[PDB]
PDB file of C-alpha atoms and ligand atoms in Angstrom:
ATOM      1  CA  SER A 247       3.654   8.942 -18.606  1.00  0.00           C
ATOM      2  CA  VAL A 248       5.110   5.498 -17.595  1.00  0.00           C
ATOM      3  CA  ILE A 249       3.022   3.098 -15.429  1.00  0.00           C
ATOM      4  CA  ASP A 250       5.007   1.131 -12.795  1.00  0.00           C
ATOM      5  CA  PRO A 251       4.030  -2.632 -12.853  1.00  0.00           C
ATOM      6  CA  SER A 252       3.173  -2.575  -9.058  1.00  0.00           C
ATOM      7  CA  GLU A 253       0.245  -0.266  -9.876  1.00  0.00           C
ATOM      8  CA  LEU A 254      -1.198  -2.893 -12.318  1.00  0.00           C
ATOM      9  CA  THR A 255      -3.158  -6.086 -11.494  1.00  0.00           C
ATOM     10  CA  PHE A 256      -4.116  -8.507 -14.308  1.00  0.00           C
ATOM     11  CA  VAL A 257      -7.557 -10.137 -13.954  1.00  0.00           C
ATOM     12  CA  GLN A 258      -8.590 -12.222 -17.022  1.00  0.00           C
ATOM     13  CA  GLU A 259      -8.203 -12.304 -20.844  1.00  0.00           C
ATOM     14  CA  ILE A 260     -10.955 -10.389 -22.740  1.00  0.00           C
ATOM     15  CA  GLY A 261     -10.425 -11.789 -26.262  1.00  0.00           C
ATOM     16  CA  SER A 262      -7.572 -11.437 -28.769  1.00  0.00           C
ATOM     17  CA  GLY A 263      -6.841  -9.295 -31.848  1.00  0.00           C
ATOM     18  CA  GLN A 264      -3.999  -9.958 -34.369  1.00  0.00           C
ATOM     19  CA  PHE A 265      -1.709  -7.251 -32.836  1.00  0.00           C
ATOM     20  CA  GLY A 266      -2.294  -7.387 -29.050  1.00  0.00           C
ATOM     21  CA  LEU A 267      -3.482  -9.950 -26.452  1.00  0.00           C
ATOM     22  CA  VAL A 268      -5.977  -7.900 -24.376  1.00  0.00           C
ATOM     23  CA  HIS A 269      -6.386  -8.410 -20.590  1.00  0.00           C
ATOM     24  CA  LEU A 270      -8.916  -6.848 -18.183  1.00  0.00           C
ATOM     25  CA  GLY A 271      -6.994  -5.260 -15.322  1.00  0.00           C
ATOM     26  CA  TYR A 272      -7.135  -3.056 -12.235  1.00  0.00           C
ATOM     27  CA  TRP A 273      -5.013   0.073 -12.105  1.00  0.00           C
ATOM     28  CA  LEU A 274      -4.171   1.497  -8.692  1.00  0.00           C
ATOM     29  CA  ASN A 275      -3.889   5.277  -9.110  1.00  0.00           C
ATOM     30  CA  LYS A 276      -2.352   7.563  -6.404  1.00  0.00           C
ATOM     31  CA  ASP A 277      -4.328  10.682  -7.448  1.00  0.00           C
ATOM     32  CA  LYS A 278      -4.347  13.995  -5.499  1.00  0.00           C
ATOM     33  CA  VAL A 279      -7.762  15.018  -4.025  1.00  0.00           C
ATOM     34  CA  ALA A 280      -9.168  17.749  -1.710  1.00  0.00           C
ATOM     35  CA  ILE A 281     -10.962  16.411   1.392  1.00  0.00           C
ATOM     36  CA  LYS A 282     -13.563  18.589   3.188  1.00  0.00           C
ATOM     37  CA  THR A 283     -14.253  17.861   6.874  1.00  0.00           C
ATOM     38  CA  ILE A 284     -17.693  18.099   8.674  1.00  0.00           C
ATOM     39  CA  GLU A 285     -30.132  10.847   6.553  1.00  0.00           C
ATOM     40  CA  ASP A 286     -28.413  14.175   7.512  1.00  0.00           C
ATOM     41  CA  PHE A 287     -26.445  14.914   4.272  1.00  0.00           C
ATOM     42  CA  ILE A 288     -26.414  11.415   2.562  1.00  0.00           C
ATOM     43  CA  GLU A 289     -29.197  12.619   0.154  1.00  0.00           C
ATOM     44  CA  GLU A 290     -27.237  15.837  -0.744  1.00  0.00           C
ATOM     45  CA  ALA A 291     -24.190  13.687  -1.795  1.00  0.00           C
ATOM     46  CA  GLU A 292     -25.874  11.512  -4.524  1.00  0.00           C
ATOM     47  CA  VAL A 293     -27.448  14.732  -5.984  1.00  0.00           C
ATOM     48  CA  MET A 294     -24.104  16.699  -6.079  1.00  0.00           C
ATOM     49  CA  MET A 295     -22.621  13.686  -7.997  1.00  0.00           C
ATOM     50  CA  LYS A 296     -25.153  14.247 -10.854  1.00  0.00           C
ATOM     51  CA  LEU A 297     -24.026  17.940 -11.105  1.00  0.00           C
ATOM     52  CA  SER A 298     -21.161  17.305 -13.574  1.00  0.00           C
ATOM     53  CA  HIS A 299     -19.667  20.227 -15.511  1.00  0.00           C
ATOM     54  CA  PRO A 300     -16.072  21.153 -16.568  1.00  0.00           C
ATOM     55  CA  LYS A 301     -16.382  24.553 -14.746  1.00  0.00           C
ATOM     56  CA  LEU A 302     -17.568  23.082 -11.397  1.00  0.00           C
ATOM     57  CA  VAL A 303     -15.335  21.471  -8.743  1.00  0.00           C
ATOM     58  CA  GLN A 304     -16.352  17.816  -8.983  1.00  0.00           C
ATOM     59  CA  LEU A 305     -17.493  15.664  -6.025  1.00  0.00           C
ATOM     60  CA  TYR A 306     -15.812  12.211  -6.227  1.00  0.00           C
ATOM     61  CA  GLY A 307     -17.500  10.610  -3.186  1.00  0.00           C
ATOM     62  CA  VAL A 308     -18.119  10.633   0.596  1.00  0.00           C
ATOM     63  CA  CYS A 309     -16.474   8.798   3.560  1.00  0.00           C
ATOM     64  CA  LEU A 310     -18.973   7.862   6.324  1.00  0.00           C
ATOM     65  CA  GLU A 311     -17.090   5.370   8.602  1.00  0.00           C
ATOM     66  CA  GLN A 312     -17.442   7.524  11.804  1.00  0.00           C
ATOM     67  CA  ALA A 313     -14.854  10.138  13.181  1.00  0.00           C
ATOM     68  CA  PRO A 314     -14.858  13.468  11.114  1.00  0.00           C
ATOM     69  CA  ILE A 315     -17.015  12.718   8.000  1.00  0.00           C
ATOM     70  CA  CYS A 316     -15.093  13.283   4.700  1.00  0.00           C
ATOM     71  CA  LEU A 317     -16.172  14.647   1.273  1.00  0.00           C
ATOM     72  CA  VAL A 318     -13.801  13.859  -1.629  1.00  0.00           C
ATOM     73  CA  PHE A 319     -13.446  16.668  -4.182  1.00  0.00           C
ATOM     74  CA  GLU A 320     -11.442  17.344  -7.340  1.00  0.00           C
ATOM     75  CA  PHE A 321      -7.957  18.755  -6.523  1.00  0.00           C
ATOM     76  CA  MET A 322      -7.428  22.317  -7.875  1.00  0.00           C
ATOM     77  CA  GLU A 323      -3.649  22.837  -8.432  1.00  0.00           C
ATOM     78  CA  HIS A 324      -3.460  26.643  -7.766  1.00  0.00           C
ATOM     79  CA  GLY A 325      -5.909  27.151  -4.822  1.00  0.00           C
ATOM     80  CA  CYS A 326      -8.494  29.944  -4.351  1.00  0.00           C
ATOM     81  CA  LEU A 327      -8.957  32.656  -7.036  1.00  0.00           C
ATOM     82  CA  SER A 328      -9.022  35.549  -4.488  1.00  0.00           C
ATOM     83  CA  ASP A 329      -5.430  34.742  -3.281  1.00  0.00           C
ATOM     84  CA  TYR A 330      -4.352  33.865  -6.861  1.00  0.00           C
ATOM     85  CA  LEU A 331      -5.454  37.334  -8.128  1.00  0.00           C
ATOM     86  CA  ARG A 332      -3.758  39.170  -5.183  1.00  0.00           C
ATOM     87  CA  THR A 333      -0.300  37.506  -5.663  1.00  0.00           C
ATOM     88  CA  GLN A 334      -0.257  38.157  -9.471  1.00  0.00           C
ATOM     89  CA  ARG A 335      -1.606  41.754  -9.147  1.00  0.00           C
ATOM     90  CA  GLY A 336      -0.324  44.150 -11.844  1.00  0.00           C
ATOM     91  CA  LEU A 337       0.724  41.078 -13.880  1.00  0.00           C
ATOM     92  CA  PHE A 338      -2.684  40.315 -15.534  1.00  0.00           C
ATOM     93  CA  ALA A 339      -3.930  41.185 -19.028  1.00  0.00           C
ATOM     94  CA  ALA A 340      -7.652  42.136 -19.472  1.00  0.00           C
ATOM     95  CA  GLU A 341      -8.132  39.082 -21.821  1.00  0.00           C
ATOM     96  CA  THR A 342      -6.947  36.687 -19.049  1.00  0.00           C
ATOM     97  CA  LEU A 343      -9.420  38.271 -16.538  1.00  0.00           C
ATOM     98  CA  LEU A 344     -12.401  38.145 -18.998  1.00  0.00           C
ATOM     99  CA  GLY A 345     -11.497  34.460 -19.551  1.00  0.00           C
ATOM    100  CA  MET A 346     -11.791  33.888 -15.757  1.00  0.00           C
ATOM    101  CA  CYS A 347     -15.305  35.451 -15.664  1.00  0.00           C
ATOM    102  CA  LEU A 348     -16.394  33.381 -18.703  1.00  0.00           C
ATOM    103  CA  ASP A 349     -15.211  30.227 -16.857  1.00  0.00           C
ATOM    104  CA  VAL A 350     -17.349  31.120 -13.754  1.00  0.00           C
ATOM    105  CA  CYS A 351     -20.345  32.121 -15.957  1.00  0.00           C
ATOM    106  CA  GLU A 352     -20.225  28.746 -17.823  1.00  0.00           C
ATOM    107  CA  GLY A 353     -20.534  26.808 -14.513  1.00  0.00           C
ATOM    108  CA  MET A 354     -23.215  29.151 -13.154  1.00  0.00           C
ATOM    109  CA  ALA A 355     -25.380  28.810 -16.319  1.00  0.00           C
ATOM    110  CA  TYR A 356     -25.298  25.004 -15.771  1.00  0.00           C
ATOM    111  CA  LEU A 357     -26.341  25.499 -12.117  1.00  0.00           C
ATOM    112  CA  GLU A 358     -29.169  27.869 -13.234  1.00  0.00           C
ATOM    113  CA  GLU A 359     -30.409  25.202 -15.781  1.00  0.00           C
ATOM    114  CA  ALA A 360     -30.186  22.564 -12.954  1.00  0.00           C
ATOM    115  CA  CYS A 361     -32.132  24.988 -10.615  1.00  0.00           C
ATOM    116  CA  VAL A 362     -29.259  25.113  -8.059  1.00  0.00           C
ATOM    117  CA  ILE A 363     -28.714  28.290  -6.019  1.00  0.00           C
ATOM    118  CA  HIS A 364     -25.103  28.911  -4.955  1.00  0.00           C
ATOM    119  CA  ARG A 365     -25.808  31.439  -2.086  1.00  0.00           C
ATOM    120  CA  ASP A 366     -22.060  32.317  -1.804  1.00  0.00           C
ATOM    121  CA  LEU A 367     -20.613  33.146  -5.222  1.00  0.00           C
ATOM    122  CA  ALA A 368     -17.258  34.895  -4.549  1.00  0.00           C
ATOM    123  CA  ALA A 369     -13.670  34.709  -5.911  1.00  0.00           C
ATOM    124  CA  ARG A 370     -12.618  32.910  -2.625  1.00  0.00           C
ATOM    125  CA  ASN A 371     -15.220  30.127  -3.449  1.00  0.00           C
ATOM    126  CA  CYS A 372     -13.745  29.771  -6.987  1.00  0.00           C
ATOM    127  CA  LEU A 373     -10.604  27.727  -7.612  1.00  0.00           C
ATOM    128  CA  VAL A 374      -7.721  27.830 -10.111  1.00  0.00           C
ATOM    129  CA  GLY A 375      -6.707  24.549 -11.826  1.00  0.00           C
ATOM    130  CA  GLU A 376      -4.677  23.436 -14.894  1.00  0.00           C
ATOM    131  CA  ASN A 377      -3.920  26.174 -17.541  1.00  0.00           C
ATOM    132  CA  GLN A 378      -5.504  28.966 -15.369  1.00  0.00           C
ATOM    133  CA  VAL A 379      -8.972  27.259 -15.562  1.00  0.00           C
ATOM    134  CA  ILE A 380     -11.511  28.661 -13.049  1.00  0.00           C
ATOM    135  CA  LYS A 381     -14.062  26.242 -11.550  1.00  0.00           C
ATOM    136  CA  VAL A 382     -16.943  27.058  -9.145  1.00  0.00           C
ATOM    137  CA  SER A 383     -17.003  25.405  -5.662  1.00  0.00           C
ATOM    138  CA  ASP A 384     -18.966  25.358  -2.323  1.00  0.00           C
ATOM    139  CA  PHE A 385     -22.452  24.922  -3.844  1.00  0.00           C
ATOM    140  CA  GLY A 386     -24.966  23.120  -1.600  1.00  0.00           C
ATOM    141  CA  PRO A 387     -21.051  38.144   3.630  1.00  0.00           C
ATOM    142  CA  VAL A 388     -23.202  41.271   2.811  1.00  0.00           C
ATOM    143  CA  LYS A 389     -20.669  42.571   0.168  1.00  0.00           C
ATOM    144  CA  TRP A 390     -21.725  39.857  -2.400  1.00  0.00           C
ATOM    145  CA  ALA A 391     -25.417  39.815  -1.298  1.00  0.00           C
ATOM    146  CA  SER A 392     -28.212  41.465  -3.343  1.00  0.00           C
ATOM    147  CA  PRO A 393     -30.839  43.745  -1.591  1.00  0.00           C
ATOM    148  CA  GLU A 394     -33.434  40.895  -1.244  1.00  0.00           C
ATOM    149  CA  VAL A 395     -30.766  38.567   0.280  1.00  0.00           C
ATOM    150  CA  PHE A 396     -29.357  40.978   2.918  1.00  0.00           C
ATOM    151  CA  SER A 397     -32.864  42.373   3.693  1.00  0.00           C
ATOM    152  CA  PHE A 398     -35.079  39.215   3.444  1.00  0.00           C
ATOM    153  CA  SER A 399     -32.799  36.208   2.532  1.00  0.00           C
ATOM    154  CA  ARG A 400     -34.695  35.769  -0.829  1.00  0.00           C
ATOM    155  CA  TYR A 401     -32.291  33.468  -2.750  1.00  0.00           C
ATOM    156  CA  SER A 402     -32.781  32.740  -6.505  1.00  0.00           C
ATOM    157  CA  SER A 403     -30.397  32.434  -9.508  1.00  0.00           C
ATOM    158  CA  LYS A 404     -30.877  36.226  -9.937  1.00  0.00           C
ATOM    159  CA  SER A 405     -29.216  36.844  -6.516  1.00  0.00           C
ATOM    160  CA  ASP A 406     -26.373  34.580  -7.745  1.00  0.00           C
ATOM    161  CA  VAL A 407     -26.225  37.069 -10.751  1.00  0.00           C
ATOM    162  CA  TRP A 408     -25.726  39.943  -8.232  1.00  0.00           C
ATOM    163  CA  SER A 409     -22.927  37.946  -6.564  1.00  0.00           C
ATOM    164  CA  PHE A 410     -21.424  37.305 -10.084  1.00  0.00           C
ATOM    165  CA  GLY A 411     -21.228  41.097 -10.760  1.00  0.00           C
ATOM    166  CA  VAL A 412     -19.262  41.482  -7.488  1.00  0.00           C
ATOM    167  CA  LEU A 413     -17.053  38.524  -8.610  1.00  0.00           C
ATOM    168  CA  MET A 414     -16.406  40.221 -12.016  1.00  0.00           C
ATOM    169  CA  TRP A 415     -15.349  43.339 -10.007  1.00  0.00           C
ATOM    170  CA  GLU A 416     -12.969  41.229  -7.821  1.00  0.00           C
ATOM    171  CA  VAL A 417     -11.466  39.641 -10.986  1.00  0.00           C
ATOM    172  CA  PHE A 418     -11.055  42.902 -12.975  1.00  0.00           C
ATOM    173  CA  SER A 419      -9.704  44.841  -9.933  1.00  0.00           C
ATOM    174  CA  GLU A 420      -7.197  41.921  -9.472  1.00  0.00           C
ATOM    175  CA  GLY A 421      -8.619  40.614  -6.152  1.00  0.00           C
ATOM    176  CA  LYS A 422      -9.465  43.843  -4.297  1.00  0.00           C
ATOM    177  CA  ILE A 423     -11.985  43.977  -1.392  1.00  0.00           C
ATOM    178  CA  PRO A 424     -15.400  45.394  -2.469  1.00  0.00           C
ATOM    179  CA  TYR A 425     -16.488  48.389  -0.280  1.00  0.00           C
ATOM    180  CA  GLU A 426     -12.998  47.968   1.411  1.00  0.00           C
ATOM    181  CA  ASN A 427     -13.291  50.241   4.499  1.00  0.00           C
ATOM    182  CA  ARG A 428     -17.115  50.011   5.000  1.00  0.00           C
ATOM    183  CA  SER A 429     -19.134  48.022   7.602  1.00  0.00           C
ATOM    184  CA  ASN A 430     -21.973  45.500   6.905  1.00  0.00           C
ATOM    185  CA  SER A 431     -24.397  48.263   8.024  1.00  0.00           C
ATOM    186  CA  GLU A 432     -22.671  50.972   5.863  1.00  0.00           C
ATOM    187  CA  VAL A 433     -22.708  48.672   2.760  1.00  0.00           C
ATOM    188  CA  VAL A 434     -26.538  48.068   3.139  1.00  0.00           C
ATOM    189  CA  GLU A 435     -27.107  51.847   3.382  1.00  0.00           C
ATOM    190  CA  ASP A 436     -24.820  52.553   0.347  1.00  0.00           C
ATOM    191  CA  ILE A 437     -26.399  50.000  -2.110  1.00  0.00           C
ATOM    192  CA  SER A 438     -29.951  51.051  -0.982  1.00  0.00           C
ATOM    193  CA  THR A 439     -29.152  54.723  -1.794  1.00  0.00           C
ATOM    194  CA  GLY A 440     -27.896  53.464  -5.190  1.00  0.00           C
ATOM    195  CA  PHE A 441     -24.067  53.420  -4.775  1.00  0.00           C
ATOM    196  CA  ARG A 442     -22.131  50.893  -6.942  1.00  0.00           C
ATOM    197  CA  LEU A 443     -18.512  49.619  -7.093  1.00  0.00           C
ATOM    198  CA  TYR A 444     -16.358  51.775  -9.414  1.00  0.00           C
ATOM    199  CA  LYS A 445     -15.131  50.769 -12.896  1.00  0.00           C
ATOM    200  CA  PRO A 446     -11.665  49.066 -12.574  1.00  0.00           C
ATOM    201  CA  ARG A 447      -9.079  50.164 -15.213  1.00  0.00           C
ATOM    202  CA  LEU A 448      -8.733  46.651 -16.731  1.00  0.00           C
ATOM    203  CA  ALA A 449     -12.515  46.512 -17.294  1.00  0.00           C
ATOM    204  CA  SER A 450     -13.758  48.010 -20.612  1.00  0.00           C
ATOM    205  CA  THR A 451     -16.875  50.251 -20.684  1.00  0.00           C
ATOM    206  CA  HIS A 452     -18.885  47.219 -22.033  1.00  0.00           C
ATOM    207  CA  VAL A 453     -17.672  44.868 -19.202  1.00  0.00           C
ATOM    208  CA  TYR A 454     -18.673  47.590 -16.660  1.00  0.00           C
ATOM    209  CA  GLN A 455     -22.130  47.865 -18.406  1.00  0.00           C
ATOM    210  CA  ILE A 456     -22.492  44.058 -17.680  1.00  0.00           C
ATOM    211  CA  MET A 457     -21.449  44.570 -14.022  1.00  0.00           C
ATOM    212  CA  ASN A 458     -24.156  47.251 -13.458  1.00  0.00           C
ATOM    213  CA  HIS A 459     -26.736  45.061 -15.201  1.00  0.00           C
ATOM    214  CA  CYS A 460     -26.012  42.303 -12.600  1.00  0.00           C
ATOM    215  CA  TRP A 461     -26.453  45.048  -9.906  1.00  0.00           C
ATOM    216  CA  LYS A 462     -29.982  46.311 -10.736  1.00  0.00           C
ATOM    217  CA  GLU A 463     -32.263  46.638  -7.631  1.00  0.00           C
ATOM    218  CA  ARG A 464     -35.064  44.406  -9.069  1.00  0.00           C
ATOM    219  CA  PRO A 465     -33.949  40.709  -9.553  1.00  0.00           C
ATOM    220  CA  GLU A 466     -36.322  40.524 -12.586  1.00  0.00           C
ATOM    221  CA  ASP A 467     -34.269  43.407 -14.172  1.00  0.00           C
ATOM    222  CA  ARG A 468     -30.951  41.450 -13.920  1.00  0.00           C
ATOM    223  CA  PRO A 469     -29.835  39.235 -16.882  1.00  0.00           C
ATOM    224  CA  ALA A 470     -29.989  35.415 -16.620  1.00  0.00           C
ATOM    225  CA  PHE A 471     -26.746  33.393 -16.577  1.00  0.00           C
ATOM    226  CA  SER A 472     -27.640  31.991 -20.050  1.00  0.00           C
ATOM    227  CA  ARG A 473     -27.851  35.635 -21.312  1.00  0.00           C
ATOM    228  CA  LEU A 474     -24.476  36.558 -19.642  1.00  0.00           C
ATOM    229  CA  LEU A 475     -22.747  33.435 -21.105  1.00  0.00           C
ATOM    230  CA  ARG A 476     -23.586  34.334 -24.723  1.00  0.00           C
ATOM    231  CA  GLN A 477     -22.534  37.989 -23.966  1.00  0.00           C
ATOM    232  CA  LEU A 478     -19.105  37.259 -22.390  1.00  0.00           C
ATOM    233  CA  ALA A 479     -18.413  34.455 -24.959  1.00  0.00           C
ATOM    234  CA  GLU A 480     -18.751  37.034 -27.824  1.00  0.00           C
ATOM    235  CA  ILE A 481     -16.426  39.642 -26.107  1.00  0.00           C
ATOM    236  CA  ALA A 482     -13.837  36.837 -25.589  1.00  0.00           C
ATOM    237  CA  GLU A 483     -13.733  35.499 -29.209  1.00  0.00           C
ATOM    238  CA  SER A 484     -14.009  39.000 -30.834  1.00  0.00           C
ATOM    239  CA  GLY A 485     -11.756  40.973 -28.426  1.00  0.00           C
TER     240      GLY A 485
HETATM  241  C1  2VV B 676      -0.148  29.132  -2.754  1.00  0.00           C
HETATM  242  N1  2VV B 676      -0.816  28.294  -3.764  1.00  0.00           N
HETATM  243  C2  2VV B 676      -0.732  28.894  -5.104  1.00  0.00           C
HETATM  244  C3  2VV B 676      -0.315  26.912  -3.786  1.00  0.00           C
HETATM  245  C4  2VV B 676      -1.264  26.027  -2.974  1.00  0.00           C
HETATM  246  C5  2VV B 676      -1.759  24.788  -3.742  1.00  0.00           C
HETATM  247  C6  2VV B 676      -1.088  23.514  -3.246  1.00  0.00           C
HETATM  248  C7  2VV B 676      -0.588  22.602  -4.175  1.00  0.00           C
HETATM  249  C8  2VV B 676      -0.022  21.399  -3.748  1.00  0.00           C
HETATM  250  C9  2VV B 676       0.042  21.094  -2.391  1.00  0.00           C
HETATM  251  C10 2VV B 676      -0.473  21.990  -1.456  1.00  0.00           C
HETATM  252  C11 2VV B 676      -1.048  23.182  -1.883  1.00  0.00           C
HETATM  253  N2  2VV B 676      -3.187  24.621  -3.440  1.00  0.00           N
HETATM  254  C12 2VV B 676      -4.086  23.862  -4.115  1.00  0.00           C
HETATM  255  C13 2VV B 676      -5.270  23.954  -3.455  1.00  0.00           C
HETATM  256  N3  2VV B 676      -6.496  23.346  -3.830  1.00  0.00           N
HETATM  257  C14 2VV B 676      -7.641  23.491  -3.111  1.00  0.00           C
HETATM  258  O1  2VV B 676      -7.660  24.149  -2.075  1.00  0.00           O
HETATM  259  C15 2VV B 676      -8.872  22.789  -3.526  1.00  0.00           C
HETATM  260  N4  2VV B 676      -9.006  21.904  -4.495  1.00  0.00           N
HETATM  261  N5  2VV B 676     -10.211  21.449  -4.562  1.00  0.00           N
HETATM  262  C16 2VV B 676     -11.014  22.007  -3.595  1.00  0.00           C
HETATM  263  C17 2VV B 676     -12.359  21.879  -3.224  1.00  0.00           C
HETATM  264  C18 2VV B 676     -12.849  22.612  -2.129  1.00  0.00           C
HETATM  265  C19 2VV B 676     -14.291  22.540  -1.755  1.00  0.00           C
HETATM  266  C20 2VV B 676     -14.840  22.847  -0.545  1.00  0.00           C
HETATM  267  N6  2VV B 676     -16.173  22.703  -0.654  1.00  0.00           N
HETATM  268  N7  2VV B 676     -16.478  22.298  -1.954  1.00  0.00           N
HETATM  269  C21 2VV B 676     -15.359  22.207  -2.619  1.00  0.00           C
HETATM  270  C22 2VV B 676     -12.014  23.517  -1.449  1.00  0.00           C
HETATM  271  C23 2VV B 676     -10.708  23.658  -1.817  1.00  0.00           C
HETATM  272  C24 2VV B 676     -10.188  22.901  -2.874  1.00  0.00           C
HETATM  273  C25 2VV B 676      -5.055  24.728  -2.307  1.00  0.00           C
HETATM  274  N8  2VV B 676      -3.820  25.116  -2.292  1.00  0.00           N
END
């Protein structure tokens, strides 16, 4: 990786060793970024900056000089996970797909520890980066919602766990639509009666046990993200 001189600006000398005269300098980098378009949200920005984790799409800064207000995010080379899964359908190995769920779970456990509620955990809100890394984004509809969320809008990290079980299904079914030909009213009726998304072929019986655990009616009966992280980390390293 060669650096063109134009990109470099020398400032001052910062001491000297025997093999190398050191200089403090400014490096002008032309890095790719993703820019989201729109006191009000100024307070939300400085907080999102503190939320730094390798499995979360990083916020770099905000642009406030009038016109549409910008938000500078980390660029994710391969786009959204939902589209990524759909185009490579029938091409994935079960180990690749468990690795994607572990990636999401790592970021979610950090958000749980930080006391941050996602409210929209779905494959479409997750992004694919370098070496098939999955990072969580859009942290600040019924298909992913738990009974307390669709019925009363009672958000908690345990409702994010319900959403995560739906995500795991999307991943293991290689980006299929949950409750495909059902309406938002039909879905509510189905879950309430006790219906659950079927076991996809690429998901082992143990992975499907985890999915149903995320889908228990009582939020207090669902595992925490910290519990899920240890669980999926063991299945990944053992096989
Ligand atoms: C088809 N696809 C596989 C290729 C598209 C790829 C691309 C690469 C280079 C140039 C153009 C397009 N692609 C990469 C992205 N990356 C992102 O979309 C992205 N990268 N970082 C993001 C952050 C947010 C975000 C919104 N709210 N919070 C975070 C939303 C989206 C993103 C999208 N398409």
